Write an enzyme that holds these catalytic residues in place. Structure first.
Site, short mmCIF file in Angstrom:
data_model
loop_
_atom_site.label_atom_id
_atom_site.label_comp_id
_atom_site.label_asym_id
_atom_site.label_seq_id
_atom_site.Cartn_x
_atom_site.Cartn_y
_atom_site.Cartn_z
CB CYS A 159 -0.99 -0.03 1.18
SG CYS A 159 -1.35 1.51 2.07
CB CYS A 162 0.87 1.66 4.29
SG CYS A 162 -0.83 1.09 4.06
#
Length: 242
Positions: A159, A162
């Site tokens: 991600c 993230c």
């Protein structure tokens, strides 16, 4: 058909629907699949009617390993699936696959001596770095520790936001590790793709605070994702108003 068949699209549902456990033998080349087939044959023989054994093409289907709680990309491997109860029984992948080893494993399975597996990276032997690394096998111990206000980040390696958030989460951990609150607050993360966790997650990242004494009403952060807002969050929602 051959005693030790060939686990694949055509055969799977038959395997599943047979209502007994299935033992997978993972390997990347036909040559190794056979060796192992023959190596394990007498055990398959013994277990007729009680356990199906089959060969699986780790090149074409390696991904299926993870379904058995085996590591991806470490072959050859072995694992037993209890279909009914939906339980997985992997056989340590660092160990060599030998008649004598497997037979013991299997006997122990049939004996109901083995505990059903779980997706987890291994527990880190050391918790160094300011952010505590949570894996499935210490989620309870660390996250549900009733005496600590726990901030936990649920992430995915792949991600983007993230990875963007990473340095500042690191910063937030270093800050609390160096504060007067060091003993009672935890800043932790877990790779939710590699570990089975309790929380139902919908997008990555996700940050929750499990406060001390209220580990049934954890709190979902939905603020700016800045180091100060997350301090404000821990203070405002944590038992210890840190």
């Amino acid at each position: 058909s051959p005693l030790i068949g060939e686990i694949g699209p055509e055969t799977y549902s038959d395997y599943m629907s047979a209502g007994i456990p299935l033992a997978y033998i993972f390997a990347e080349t036909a040559e190794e699949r056979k060796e192992l087939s023959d190596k394990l044959k007498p055990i398959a023989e013994a277990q007729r009617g009680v356990i199906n054994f089959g060969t699986i093409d780790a090149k074409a289907f390696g991904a299926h390993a993870g379904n058995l709680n085996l590591k991806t990309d470490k072959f050859p491997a072995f694992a037993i699936q209890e279909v009914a109860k939906n339980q997985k029984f992997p056989f340590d992948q660092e160990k060599e696959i030998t008649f004598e080893a497997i037979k013991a494993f299997v006997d122990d399975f049939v004996a109901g001596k083995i505990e059903p597996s779980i997706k987890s990276e291994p527990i880190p032997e050391k918790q160094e770095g300011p952010v505590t690394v949570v894996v499935a096998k210490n989620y309870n111990e660390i996250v549900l520790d009733d005496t600590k206000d726990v901030l936990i980040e649920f992430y995915a390696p792949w991600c983007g936001h993230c990875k963007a958030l990473a340095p500042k989460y690191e910063e937030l951990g270093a800050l609390y590790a160096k504060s007067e609150f060091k003993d009672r607050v935890v800043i932790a993360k877990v790779d939710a793709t590699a570990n089975d966790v309790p929380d139902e997650i919908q997008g990555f990242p996700t940050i929750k605070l499990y406060p001390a004494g209220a580990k049934g009403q954890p709190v979902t952060y939905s603020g700016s994702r800045t180091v100060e807002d997350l301090i404000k969050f821990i203070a405002e929602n944590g038992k210890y108003k840190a």
